[PDB]
Design a protein around this motif. Structure first.
Motif, PDB file in Angstrom:
ATOM      1  N   UNK A  58     -23.838 102.220 -47.010  1.00 34.60           N
ATOM      2  CA  UNK A  58     -23.258 100.899 -47.202  1.00 34.60           C
ATOM      3  C   UNK A  58     -22.068 100.937 -48.144  1.00 34.60           C
ATOM      4  N   UNK A  59     -21.255  99.908 -48.057  1.00 35.30           N
ATOM      5  CA  UNK A  59     -20.140  99.745 -48.973  1.00 35.30           C
ATOM      6  C   UNK A  59     -19.755  98.269 -49.020  1.00 35.30           C
ATOM      7  N   UNK A  60     -19.507  97.789 -50.234  1.00 36.78           N
ATOM      8  CA  UNK A  60     -19.110  96.420 -50.508  1.00 36.78           C
ATOM      9  C   UNK A  60     -17.761  96.470 -51.216  1.00 36.78           C
ATOM     10  N   UNK A 104     -18.036  99.225 -54.116  1.00 37.24           N
ATOM     11  CA  UNK A 104     -19.291  99.868 -54.475  1.00 37.24           C
ATOM     12  C   UNK A 104     -19.807 100.430 -53.168  1.00 37.24           C
ATOM     13  N   UNK A 105     -20.151 101.717 -53.161  1.00 30.87           N
ATOM     14  CA  UNK A 105     -20.555 102.451 -51.960  1.00 30.87           C
ATOM     15  C   UNK A 105     -21.838 103.192 -52.267  1.00 30.87           C
ATOM     16  N   UNK A 106     -22.673 103.335 -51.256  1.00 31.11           N
ATOM     17  CA  UNK A 106     -24.003 103.944 -51.421  1.00 31.11           C
ATOM     18  C   UNK A 106     -24.226 104.929 -50.289  1.00 31.11           C
ATOM     19  N   UNK A 223     -17.693  94.156 -46.091  1.00 33.32           N
ATOM     20  CA  UNK A 223     -18.973  94.794 -46.336  1.00 33.32           C
ATOM     21  C   UNK A 223     -19.402  95.503 -45.074  1.00 33.32           C
TER      22      UNK A 223
END
Ligand SMILES: [Cl-]
Ligand SMILES: [Cl-]
Lengths: 275, 276
Positions: A58-60, A104-106, A223
């Protein structure tokens, strides 16, 4: 100008300039603006390189100030957490000390577990469907691409000549005009690029505008949640809609599927339309 | 415990300890875990107080580490952008220097412009639906609320008894068990609270679990877009579903509506389910 699939892959080829700092570049654009798709994809690459071998999940992001396509962009990555299954990164994008974007990336490790999805919608197949170029032909005087695009619904410029704005739904069949590198991070970065490329168009149509006006827009956020690998050797379907538009803002959500039916990613973004 | 609506409103009363630094607190829970709904709502309040008179429009966050309910939480706010349209804030939540959560929030001026939404789904009304307490009564041996909740689809524990797990969709009518402060920022924070509270339940059912197990879960992220004011003087419908579950992760999305039909907000979150 970005015209080939190779040009998109070049966008992803960042130059590392310090342990957690990378520089991206691009060709100039007609209004000199950097598009959201580029900064999403490049930011994800920068993050992914600081989390080697882990898969983007994911990434926001928020777009604060719009990039100038005549200058490079510096991506600075900060580790937030390094877990055994999930790891997290902040990415800040800057040009001459001006912050353009924060994300913010996961990232995760692959795991075999419950694998379920909604079924892809039953739509006309890519062969039934008109190409974007032929659809825009009447407007040529007003103006190669990395992806072929076939629109099941009128594109914004075409929609503008319909008596009334259509419902905010847009389905597009997409195919890469070349070979995407067989690398999981490149795969996800290309997905990221596509996820933000046409996504605001269904809102533009309801707002009676197009990417070049008359009413101009800027993305406020974007997102993405990545679930399954894109198969770029065949068509993909991007199923986009708007649930709500209010107060100069329009929200658009899109679901990307491989032609074979797998749900690749979900993305959502809010665009702001100048008064 | 947090059990009344006044208790939820009290979560939002933050101590200000510096220009852009606030402290939130809460009662200890049984397993000392702080729930994401609390941290989202308190972070938004922190951010909002640094952008006075602008209305919340979106918020994105990652839950990096689970909070200890026995300690307070410091919310540090950093302004990222200001001016005539949109204002932007970073919020970091920490406990003794350990960062729990990172968010980015965005605020706007009011503006009249195109106002369009999808139609709320046609569903049974709140009185046709059984209350959550009643639906869960058969399982009491295994175990007040700020909101009355009426589940149109089986709650996770009930669903767990079914042979074929149902579609991962969950509609809940909700009503505040009391009056919510008539303040736009408070309103948005309570909306944020609700937006994260039940949202993963539709995934839990597909994962053959419940909020209390056997397979435990934690939120990875949460995302909210605020479009229209919640009317807490009446029922709200939270229409939730999962489009996809893979890799120990499940994605849940929800649309909150006023009973009168206005679409209040959209929220999306991904939860992670520890190995089974
Ligand atoms: Cl982990
Ligand atoms: Cl084409």
């Amino acid at each position: 100008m970005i015209s080939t699939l190779e040009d998109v892959l070049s966008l992803l080829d960042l130059q590392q300039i310090d342990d957690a700092a990378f520089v991206g570049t691009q060709p100039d654009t007609p209004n000199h603006h950097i598009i959201g798709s580029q900064v999403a994809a490049q930011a994800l690459m920068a993050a992914g390189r600081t989390t080697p071998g882990r898969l983007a999940h994911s990434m926001h992001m928020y777009f604060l100030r719009r990039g100038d396509a005549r200058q490079p962009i510096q991506y600075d990555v900060t580790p937030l957490r390094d877990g055994g299954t999930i790891s997290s990164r902040r990415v800040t994008a800057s040009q001459s000390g001006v912050v353009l974007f924060e994300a913010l990336a996961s990232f995760t490790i692959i795991a075999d577990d419950v694998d379920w999805q909604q079924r892809m919608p039953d739509v006309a197949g890519p062969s039934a469907v008109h190409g974007l170029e032929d659809l825009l032909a009447p407007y040529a005087e007003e103006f190669q691409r990395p992806f072929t695009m076939r629109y099941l619904d009128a594109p914004p410029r075409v929609a503008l000549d319909l008596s009334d704005p259509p419902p905010p739904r847009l389905r597009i069949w997409l195919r890469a005009n070349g070979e995407v590198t067989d690398d999981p991070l490149v795969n996800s970065c290309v997905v990221a690029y596509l996820s933000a490329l046409t996504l605001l168009e269904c809102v533009m149509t309801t707002m009676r505008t197009t990417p070049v006006g008359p009413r101009l827009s800027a993305l406020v956020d974007h997102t993405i949640w990545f679930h399954r690998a894109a198969d770029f050797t065949d068509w993909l379907l991007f199923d986009q809609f708007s649930p709500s538009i209010v107060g100069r803002r329009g929200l658009a959500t899109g679901t990307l599927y491989n032609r074979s039916g797998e749900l690749v990613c979900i993305a959502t973004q809010e665009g702001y339309f100048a008064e």
